[PDB]
């Protein structure tokens, strides 16, 4: 034990020295050659009503016109974001839900929560209705989020400190990703769909390879547990939000931290993050009941989106980049442009 | 209007969906929700049974009221990531055991008091009253004839009799409330013979309902 721990310490010293070896320049010294974007103002264009309890997640379609939301009513709702119509309303067998997803082809939806099961629903039948195609079981802690890869492969992360890759038609797992110590909070797929990232309650993130299962890299730096994560549009960076009122931008190739987003006037945690196409705006929810907009390259600017009366718990951006949607703990979804 | 016929059919569909959502939302707000909590070997299996993986939910009816009680003992994670979603519940049932006033795990009773203090002063439950159940009093009555309470209460200086011990213990539970102006605490000595338990819970819920009504009207 003593020799193994000493060698582990030596290896950690090697890793820290390798990370600190190539740190020659930082963003703040070379981003001073760009004009600031200026004041950014957005206006509520539509308002979607109908949920009754708090709202916990949502996900855009790939045609940038259809939308799905989940609340603790025990209801999953599909919206037309152009004319504020309702297309489908799906009832649940367990109302303690925390996540949802929207299949990339547009055929299926998924949900889960405090019951240790992920349910998969088929939207296009010959009988007019929506039915439960599949029930994936096998975890022992609650589910955090789930994201489709295609019509036949799904990825889940739980509070067991484990992630899993599932083959839908068979119903059994294919590979399990272990190595975390605390609860896993969220994950984000790569645009080219070969890797992903995962953040945990132990204040650390890890990069996973889908088809073999070996963790490639790990990242630390936050002072407390991690709450949200996403990829940069080119699939070569990522941004994390935590419970100590700070956001951070990491790059895979540099294998260390790049930049931080914090302000003195904020004392609450971050509940979700997202990006925009050119990677020039970073949108982040908070507990102050409102959302902020940061300039990614400079991190000394902001726009504000206010109009909710409780914690902003989810937000999202389309594939064509022409709208933003937010949902909060007071049952209303809002669309901004 | 500047719409086709298919779009008007779509609008009709949306209105029907809205009507159904509102009907279900009216229906699902007339039932009493209870959250059940305890410690290890707290004797709450009897509490579950006598009252007519993941979360386990049970339903019953009594005197034209519909009770849903949620048991969440099988979750093995930190409560900070999970407890906020029970914020709107109507009451909390809490189970403890009297017979374990001297056992060692340091003491069972001490950790039970720390748990009670932890969930009695939390910020999500500043307005929700608490029901308390005291279990396994018979073995406690048989054990006191051999060991005094000083083994766990060195400062206790009363008789080694059942009634004084029971009243004492109830007092150091009911002492832990720091919000006496907002929420009350009800207690009961668990009788494992008949259906008095459901009657006690029913009376406590009725009081909670009445006082909430009066609070809302600014009265």
């Amino acid at each position, epitope marked *: 034990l003593d020799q193994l721990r000493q060698e582990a310490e030596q290896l950690k010293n090697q890793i820290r020295d390798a990370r600190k070896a190539c740190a020659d320049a930082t963003l703040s010294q070379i981003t001073n050659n760009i004009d600031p974007v200026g004041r950014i103002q957005m206006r509520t264009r539509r308002t979607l009503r109908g949920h009754l309890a708090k709202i916990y997640a949502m996900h855009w379609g790939t045609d940038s016109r259809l939308l799905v939301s989940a609340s603790q009513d025990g209801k999953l709702i599909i919206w037309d974001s152009y004319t504020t*119509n309702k297309v489908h309303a799906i009832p649940l067998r367990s109302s303690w839900v925390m996540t949802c997803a929207y299949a990339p082809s547009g055929n299926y939806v998924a949900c889960g929560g405090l019951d240790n099961i992920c349910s998969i629903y088929n939207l296009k039948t010959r009988e*007019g209705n929506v039915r439960v195609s599949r029930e994936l079981a096998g975890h022992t802690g609650y589910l955090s989020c789930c994201r489709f890869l295609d019509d036949n492969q799904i990825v889940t992360s739980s509070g067991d400190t484990t992630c899993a890759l599932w083959d839908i038609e068979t119903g059994q797992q294919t590979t399990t990703f272990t190595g975390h110590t605390g609860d896993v909070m969220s994950l984000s797929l790569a645009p080219d769909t070969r890797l992903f990232v995962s953040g945990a309650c132990d204040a650390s993130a890890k990069l996973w390879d889908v088809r073999e299962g070996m963790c490639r890299q790990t990242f630390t730096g936050h002072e407390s547990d991690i709450n949200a994560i996403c990829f940069f549009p080119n699939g070569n960076a990522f941004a994390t939000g935590s419970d100590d009122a700070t956001c951070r931008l990491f790059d895979l190739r540099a294998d260390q931290e790049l930049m931080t987003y914090s302000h003195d006037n904020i004392i609450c945690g971050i509940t979700s993050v997202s990006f925009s196409k050119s990677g020039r705006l970073l949108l982040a929810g908070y507990d102050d009941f409102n959302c902020n907009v940061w300039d990614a390259l400079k991190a000394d600017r902001a726009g504000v989106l206010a109009g909710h009366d409780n914690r902003v718990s989810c937000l999202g951006v389309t594939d064509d980049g022409m709208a933003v949607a937010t949902g909060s703990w007071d049952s209303f979804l809002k669309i901004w442009n | 209007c500047t719409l086709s016929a298919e779009d008007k059919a*779509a609008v009709e*569909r949306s209105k029907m969906i809205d009507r159904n959502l509102r009907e279900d939302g009216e229906k699902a707000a007339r039932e009493v929700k209870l959250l059940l909590l305890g410690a290890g070997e707290s004797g709450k299996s009897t509490i579950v049974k006598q009252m007519k993986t993941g979360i386990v939910e049970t339903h019953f009816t009594f005197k034209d009221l519909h009770f849903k009680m949620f048991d969440v003992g099988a979750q093995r994670s930190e409560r900070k990531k999970w407890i906020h979603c029970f914020e709107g519940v109507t009451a909390i049932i809490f189970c403890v055991a009297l017979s374990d006033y001297d056992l060692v795990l340091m003491n069972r009773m001490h950790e039970s008091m720390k748990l009670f203090d932890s969930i009695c002063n939390n910020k999500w439950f500043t307005d929700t009253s608490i029901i308390l159940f005291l279990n396994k009093k018979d073995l406690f009555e048989e054990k006191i004839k051999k060991s005094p309470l000083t083994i766990c209460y060195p400062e206790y200086a009363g008789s080694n009799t059942y009634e004084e011990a029971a009243a004492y213990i109830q007092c150091q539970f009911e002492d832990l409330n720091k919000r006496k102006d907002t929420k009350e605490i009800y207690t009961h000595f668990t009788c494992s013979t008949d259906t008095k338990n459901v009657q006690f819970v029913f009376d406590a819920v009725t009081d909670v309902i009445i006082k909430n009504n009066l609070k809302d009207c600014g009265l």
Partner: single-chain antibody
Amino acid sequence: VQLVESGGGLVQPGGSRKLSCSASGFAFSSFGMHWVRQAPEKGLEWVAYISSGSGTIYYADTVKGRFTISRDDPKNTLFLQMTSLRSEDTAMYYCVRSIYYYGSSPFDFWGQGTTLTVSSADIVMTQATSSVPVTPGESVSISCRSSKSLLHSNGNTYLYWFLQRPGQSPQLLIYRMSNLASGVPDRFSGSGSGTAFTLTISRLEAEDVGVYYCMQHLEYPLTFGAGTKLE
């Protein structure tokens, strides 16, 4: 999916009848329903439309005050109550299905129909040809013409192409003027510009012979074409 009708037969002048349709195998109470008519030797003619939730009813122009349409959800049954008959009402009747929301495919399943024999600001659609002789292995094109623009401000274009093989009920080929139906081979297509539209078929096969129709759904009433024959 199964729609079975009854009520047909021989009726004397005057009189009345009640035709019924029975569904089985799908969520009946989410689909709007139509009654459609076919003359013994002529094309098709829309008759009546009833909505979901029984909120809306539409009749044809030559039936108002004579025909009445009704539905019943608990037993999934459709009724047409029809009175004061005349010699111009000897035909066959089909019952058809549709469902409207963003992206759906109306007019997908057609019943089998039943026979009944007794002893203007509308839009006009014209089937230009009458009959075309062709040989298998080649490609064919058919066209029909309109009397008004069919494109709408929101981008849609409400033209429908249907097929009818000998001795059978029709089926949907192309809905909303460009989109392919469910279960139709990937060798049909259609296009067109304002008031003039063209369907095309490639590599003609056997059992791909019969009468083709084009319909519009811009506003009520619904008007069918004359009917093309391919042989």
